[PDB]
Amino acid sequence: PILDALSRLDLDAELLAKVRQSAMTIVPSVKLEDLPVVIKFILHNVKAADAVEVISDLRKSLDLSSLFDVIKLAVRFQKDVSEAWIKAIENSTSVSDHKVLDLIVLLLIHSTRKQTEKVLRSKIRLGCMPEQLMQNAFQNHSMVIKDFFPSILSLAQTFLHSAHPAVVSFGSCMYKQAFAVFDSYCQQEVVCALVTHVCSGNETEL
């Protein structure tokens, strides 16, 4: 309620800083149904240079636990923090081992793009992001499949056809994984994309 009131109230820098470090200190300690309001506040109410590491603190807070779609909307409400998220995962994947939350939020920012795909290509050439984690993600968190978002992720294979063909195989694997869950209309759209692939282009994607 204090953070909700401060959301309602105006902002002053000196107090905002100390209360926001206090918030970051007290985000993960509470139950998963309680911190989302805090995350929404720090998203649509707070914007600063230090957010580039505050969001990394949030990532560490949410690393363990990973219906709970309010966080997605909170990230939708503002876009500058999403660019900060891209900047943070530019180095978060450089040290941390590509946690599932990283690829989830990467899909979210790519949905809400050019910088995301540039980062994806760079880490394709860098560390290839072991895809068992995203297999588990599509196994458990398939409620946000909505093929229009991963469609660009798949068609990135075309730009990844110049070299490193293994990542094309990983993209094929993850489209195989995403097909066998639900969303029969999305399944037929995936089959339409696949027949497009066998029709246009050379024999490789065929």
């Binding site: 105006d10 876009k79 500058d80 339409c192 497009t196």
Partner: protein, 948 residues
């Protein structure tokens, strides 16, 4: 017999070959359409064949890739590939879910290339001269919608998808893309009935989550489409209710424009009005600055949304909302003072209640004491911080009082207390004031800024009553001396204390601080002050004219107002958003501004204004130019030619004056005023020429030693001799003078002391001119690359101009690389620009496909005019930088790897051009290298004898 033919062709394409059938059918329907445009029986059959082709590409997807033919046609010669039927066919296929992105980015690059080409042609008539073939994709793509009024559904889907991704790809060619997208969306919304709801849904879904990029296009095209068709939103079941959440993203101007657009639909529909009132009611008491700004912005519009001036519960209920909101901070107290007048122009008794509320507000700081110690209750506006902008409140009070007086208990009290204040300020000088100290102000101090906010607030207090006494009194000497005393208090406390100790450490680029006057008032003041002499004048202006300090302020406020109209699209005071209103105001003030200049600093102020009226006139009121041009007393050129002639007379008299009377500030503005007024002279007028020959002849004769004066005047000459002829003739002559003026690269042979221009003297040949000439030379090379790109029966004509221009252009650099340039950036520009002109390579690279004698002569010229002279420059730049490097602290690594970096790049460009001559010499069976000489390189030997 055409439907049977197309039937047998797609039957053949279904199973057999599919290569040349599409080219044949598109060419045939191209000639058919070009005949037809010079009806229904053709539109129906064309729709049927379009549907047949889209069915063919759907079933036989292999007929669409053979995009390659169109791309090759565009590459062979740009433009002649986007035929109306070709673009309609690809637009229909764009919604195939397959190969959309390839076709779509092909269209994107084609349209951006076309808009860039149009920009260049509008920036260069010489290219229009040698390349009359223009392909304006905007027109043909906005013609499809004109033809799409015959039941085309998938065509319309392609159109709307293309527009959606157009706004997506926007973020000046990007601005042109926005214009094209808005146009096509408006056309497809206006004529297509069953998809207009889809268009509304798309534009509603596209505006959200879009604030980093300039998104004014969304609101403006939404306003256009709703003013063309307001019933679409109700047809869409009023899906604008969800948009009310935009109070947190960026409600600085988007909310105002959105409410402006949706005004009629809010009025007709009660449900959306109720949603708006409830959303704003919950928004107002949110204690966020941004939320409160959005709330007050919405209040500024909702009051005038409902009109009763010519349901009474609706009138009376809304009164108390802004009164309650008045208790908030000063920042949110600000805009209500400005916006009160707009709604006060729309009520009779609500106006009385608003005056009563404002009167109760002003009683908070009135201190009724009957002409004693000043009524300064500014102590309340301290919570280092400020709580109420007294100046804005007083300005609103004066403006609303004037409106009420002009419309037809407390009003008599309202006038007398305002009069009492005016009589109190004249009796309260800087002795009863708390801020009598000359240095009590202190930046970054808890008390100094408190004095500063008190100091700035009282300045607005004085300014407002200047408006009151001038308006309440009518040629009454008693009030005029009150105005003098008010400015006497104003200047005595604004000229000194502030901008001495307040803030003047940096030189003030601007002038007397932000003024709270009326554009109507300042127009009346200047028109009554200057260009007005009648018996009604009560000798008050005679003693008023003695206050020359008042004169400077009287016009500097106007410069502030029109500057607001320059940087932004609006201003302050009453009637700040009615474009016709200031247009009349600008039409009126310009004459007296000109009259003051022509009456004979003070005139420097009015002339600077005129420069900014003309700048604002073209940049904002482009459609309203003819009336403004005629208002100075139909062809614009004859009146424009008259206007510059009087400005020409001022320049020729001013330039011919002695150096002691040059007043450079005047010269820069008058030169720029011509460069702005000469923009709108039409191409098909003789006055174009005698003016153009006048600025040339004034350049040949006049010898001005000022630098910005020469730079500004040259820009005008090169901003006009860029749409009439080829500027390379002028550039060569300038280069002829620079080489003659300066020394020689070899300092052994003496250049004849010619003088093609008198402006270029021993001083002006500095980077002042040598950077402008190389700037123009870079521009010419930039468009030549486009011509070379276009070059890669009309081809022969293109090669004629390019060889001729590059031949002249080579004579420019040959005579310019031989110049003994001084050190600094002028040397660096030449070395890099020399790297540009050689990249001569692309033209050679293209002609590998083929030889002509003219091209051989160019290389003969290039070999004998550029390369041997170019290497001599490098042997000279090594010693001029050695001399320049001795003046270090009299690390250095910065100044050694920065003055020498261009040299390796220039070497690479020479050899790359040299290398591609090898390819042509062998292939074209002609040896073209006897003209040139061997490549020269350089070595060193560290002088260990003089090591230390």
């Amino acid at each position: 017999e055409i439907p049977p033919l197309v039937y047998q062709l797609l039957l053949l394409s279904a199973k057999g070959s599919k290569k040349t059938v599409l080219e044949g059918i598109i060419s045939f329907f191209n000639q058919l359409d070009k005949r037809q445009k010079e009806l229904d029986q053709l539109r129906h059959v064309e729709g049927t064949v379009i549907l047949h082709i889209v069915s063919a590409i759907n079933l036989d997807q292999d007929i669409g890739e053979e995009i390659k033919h169109l791309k090759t046609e565009q590459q062979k010669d740009p433009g002649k590939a986007l035929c109306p039927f070709s673009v309609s066919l690809l637009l229909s296929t764009a919604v195939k879910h397959r190969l959309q992105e390839q076709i779509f980015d092909f269209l994107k690059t084609s349209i951006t290339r076309s808009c860039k080409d149009l920009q260049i042609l509008q920036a260069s008539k010489f290219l229009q001269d040698l390349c009359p073939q223009q392909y304006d994709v905007t027109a043909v793509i906005l013609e499809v919608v004109k033809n799409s009024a015959f039941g085309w559904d998938h065509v319309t889907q392609g159109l709307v998808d293309l527009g959606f991704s157009l706004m997506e790809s926007y973020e000046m060619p990007a601005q042109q893309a926005c214009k094209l997208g808005a146009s096509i969306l408006l056309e497809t919304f206006k004529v297509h009935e069953p998809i207009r709801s889809d268009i509304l849904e798309q534009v509603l879904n596209r505006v959200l989550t879009k604030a980093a990029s300039p998104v004014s296009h969304f609101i403006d095209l939404l306003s256009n489409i709703v003013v063309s068709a307001p019933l679409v939103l109700q047809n869409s079941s009023s899906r604008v209710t969800e948009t009310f959440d935009n109070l947190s993203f960026l409600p600085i101007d988007t909310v105002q424009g959105l409410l402006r657009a949706v005004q009629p639909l809010l009025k007709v529909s009660m449900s959306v009005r109720d949603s708006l009132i409830l959303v704003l009611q919950k928004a107002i008491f949110s204690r966020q600055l941004d939320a409160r700004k959005a709330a007050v912005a919405g209040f500024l519009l909702l009051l005038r949304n409902f009109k009763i001036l010519g349901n009474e519960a609706f009138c009376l209920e809304i009164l108390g909302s802004l009164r309650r909101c008045l208790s908030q901070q000063a920042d949110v107290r600000l805009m209500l003072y400005e916006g009160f007048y707009d709604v006060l122009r729309r009520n009779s008794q609500l106006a009385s209640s608003i005056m009563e509320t404002l009167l109760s507000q002003i009683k908070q700081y009135y201190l009724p004491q009957q002409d004693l110690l000043p009524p300064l209750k500014l102590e309340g506006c301290i919570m280092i911080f400020l709580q109420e902008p007294l100046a804005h409140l007083l300005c609103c009070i004066q403006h609303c009082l004037a409106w009420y007086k002009s419309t037809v208990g407390f009003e008599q009290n309202f006038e007398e207390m305002l009069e009492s204040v005016t009589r109190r300020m004249i009796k309260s000088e800087l002795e009863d004031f708390e801020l009598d100290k000359s240095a009590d102000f202190s930046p970054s101090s808890g008390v100094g800024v408190k004095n500063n906010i008190y100091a700035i607030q009282v300045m607005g207090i004085c300014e407002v009553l200047i408006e009151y006494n001038f308006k309440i009194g009518n040629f009454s000497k008693n009030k005029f001396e009150d105005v003098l005393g008010l400015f006497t208090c104003y200047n005595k406390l604004s000229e000194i204390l502030k901008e001495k100790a307040g803030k003047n450490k940096s030189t003030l680029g601007n002038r007397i601080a932000r003024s709270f006057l009326s554009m109507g008032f300042v127009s009346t003041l200047l028109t009554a002050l200057f260009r007005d002499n009648a018996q009604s004048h009560e000798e008050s202006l005679a003693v008023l004219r003695s206050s020359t300090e008042f004169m400077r302020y009287a016009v500097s406020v106007a410069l502030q107002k029109v500057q607001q109209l320059e940087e932004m699209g609006q201003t302050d005071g009453p009637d700040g958003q009615n474009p016709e209103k200031m247009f009349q105001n600008l039409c009126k003030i310009t004459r007296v501004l000109l009259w003051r200049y022509t009456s004979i600093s003070i005139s420097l102020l009015c002339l600077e204004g005129l420069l900014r009226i003309f700048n604002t006139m073209q940049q904002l009121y482009a459609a309203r130019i003819p009336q403004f041009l005629q208002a100075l007393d139909i062809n614009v050129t004859e009146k424009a030619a008259f206007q510059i002639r009087q400005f020409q007379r001022s320049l020729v008299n001013q330039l011919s004056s002695a150096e002691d009377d040059f007043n450079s500030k005047e010269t820069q503005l008058l030169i720029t005023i011509l460069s702005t007024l000469s923009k709108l002279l039409d191409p098909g007028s003789q006055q174009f020429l005698q003016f153009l020959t006048w600025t040339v002849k004034i350049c040949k004769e006049n010898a001005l030693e000022d630098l910005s004066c020469c730079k500004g005047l040259l820009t005008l000459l090169f901003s006009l001799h860029v749409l009439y002829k080829s500027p390379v003739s002028l550039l060569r002559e300038l280069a002829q003078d620079i080489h003659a003026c300066l020394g020689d690269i070899d300092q052994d042979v003496e250049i004849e002391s010619r003088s093609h221009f008198a402006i270029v003297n021993v001083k002006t040949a500095a980077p002042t001119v040598c950077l402008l000439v190389l700037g123009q030379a870079d521009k010419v090379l930039e468009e030549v690359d486009w011509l070379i790109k276009r070059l890669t029966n009309q081809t022969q004509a293109l090669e004629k101009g390019v060889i001729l221009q590059l031949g002249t252009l080579l004579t420019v650099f040959h005579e310019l690389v031989q110049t003994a340039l001084p050190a600094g950036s002028c040397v660096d520009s030449l070395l890099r620009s020399l790297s540009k002109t050689y990249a001569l390579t692309s033209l050679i690279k293209h002609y590998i496909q083929a030889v002509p004698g003219r091209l051989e002569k160019l290389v003969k010229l290039s070999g004998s005019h550029l390369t041997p002279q170019c290497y001599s420059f490098i042997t000279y730049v090594q010693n001029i930088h050695s001399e320049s490097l001795s003046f270090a602290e009299e690390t250095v690594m910065a100044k050694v790897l920065r003055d020498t970096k261009p040299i390796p790049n220039l070497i690479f460009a020479i050899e790359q051009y040299e290398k591609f001559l090898i390819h042509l010499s062998k292939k074209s069976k002609v040896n073209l290298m006897q003209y040139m000489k061997l490549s020269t390189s350089r070595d060193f030997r560290i002088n260990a004898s003089m090591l230390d």
